[PDB]
Ligand binder design. Structure first.
Ligand SMILES: Nc1nccc(-c2c[nH]c3ccccc23)n1
Length: 330
């Protein structure tokens, strides 16, 4: 649909992303000097229409409270309808953190950069949690760089050229699934690899599910790959038990997902083929650390706290923002 013109000013010039909802495109703005903006064009389908209308209402609230994007939510500039598609116009951001890592060969981010990004992500989502909202769909595809310009240098260690961001500042996008405390809470939220155990076990969720997703994001930034290479719920749980230890009994007792459990234990055979796969690919969390220096132990301390099983016990973002891991930023 490149060449189409929306609202008589925004001409499509490229596709930035795609999703359940539709697509995000880059447009030239013919009424503002040809400067470029992003536009989310939503499918003409009820569920996605209603999510976009929700998104707009959230964005108007967040933009009114924080018009300068101090807390780094993406800025909506305007919204309109076009051939029954709701279109939301945004400031143009650069690549998602996912796309940057992909294009860099799945090399992980440097720790100094991870520190800055984690801080900004926590600061943004916390702003949300302070406003009775939960995002519910945090993942690297929904954390975008403000500018994804990079310098390149030969890295002798790994015998290859690598890209380093000039500026690693980010913003959080996609408020289509965002849910106020008092609204209906969907049964299933999040993209599988970022999904908290309370969601898998259908216990109910709130702000702490976002904290779990952030835990998973930070691991991926650190390693360049997921520690939950799965598309199956019961196996995901097996993976969690290998990385983090057994699930709390009280959560197993509460759940109605009885098919995952035998007696009051995860119904998992470590000697099955799936069992080998899990044992090969997943190991205790701190065994993933690439170094033992204190900066690393502290990242991993934080991550472990974010990946607390019990959402009542899990670290809050308010508490995360004061974590020792973040001092070299002050
Ligand atoms: N709200 C929302 N939901 C999903 C994706 C985007 C989005 C993807 N790529 C972008 C580039 C610039 C501004 C926004 C986006 N935004």
């Amino acid at each position: 649909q490149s060449g189409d013109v929306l609202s008589a000013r925004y001409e499509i010039v490229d596709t930035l992303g795609e999703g359940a909802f539709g697509k995000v495109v880059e447009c030239i703005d013919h009424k503002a000097g040809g400067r470029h903006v992003a536009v989310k064009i939503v499918k003409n389908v009820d569920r996605y229409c209603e999510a976009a209308r929700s998104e707009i209402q959230v964005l108007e609230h967040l933009n009114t409270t924080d018009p300068n994007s101090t807390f780094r939510c993406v800025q909506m500039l305007e919204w309109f309808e076009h051939h029954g598609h709701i279109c939301i116009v945004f400031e143009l951001l650069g690549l998602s953190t996912y796309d940057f890592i992909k294009e860099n060969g799945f090399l992980p981010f440097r720790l100094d950069h991870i520190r800055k990004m984690a801080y900004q992500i926590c600061k943004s989502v916390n702003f949300l949690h302070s406003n009775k909202l939960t995002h519910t769909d945090l993942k690297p595809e929904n954390i975008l760089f403000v500018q994804s310009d990079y310098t390149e240098a030969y890295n002798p260690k790994i015998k290859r050229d690598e890209r380093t961001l000039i500026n690693p500042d980010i913003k959080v996008v996609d408020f289509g699934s965002a849910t106020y405390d008092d609204e209906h809470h969907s049964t299933l939220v999040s993209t599988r690899h970022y999904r908290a155990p309370e969601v898998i076990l259908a216990l109910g969720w709130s702000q702490p599910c976002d904290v779990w997703s952030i835990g998973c994001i930070l691991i991926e930034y650190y390693l360049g790959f997921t520690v939950f290479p799965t598309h199956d719920s019961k196996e995901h749980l097996a993976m969690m038990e290998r990385i983090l230890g057994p699930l709390p009994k009280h959560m197993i007792q509460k759940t109605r997902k009885r098919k995952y459990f035998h007696h009051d234990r995860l119904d998992w055979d470590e000697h099955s083929s799936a069992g080998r796969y899990v044992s090969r690919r997943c190991k205790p969390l701190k065994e993933f650390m690439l170094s033992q220096d204190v900066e690393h132990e502290r990242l991993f301390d934080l991550i472990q706290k974010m990946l607390e099983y019990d959402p009542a016990k899990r670290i809050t973002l308010r508490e995360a923002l004061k974590h020792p891991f973040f001092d070299l930023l002050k």
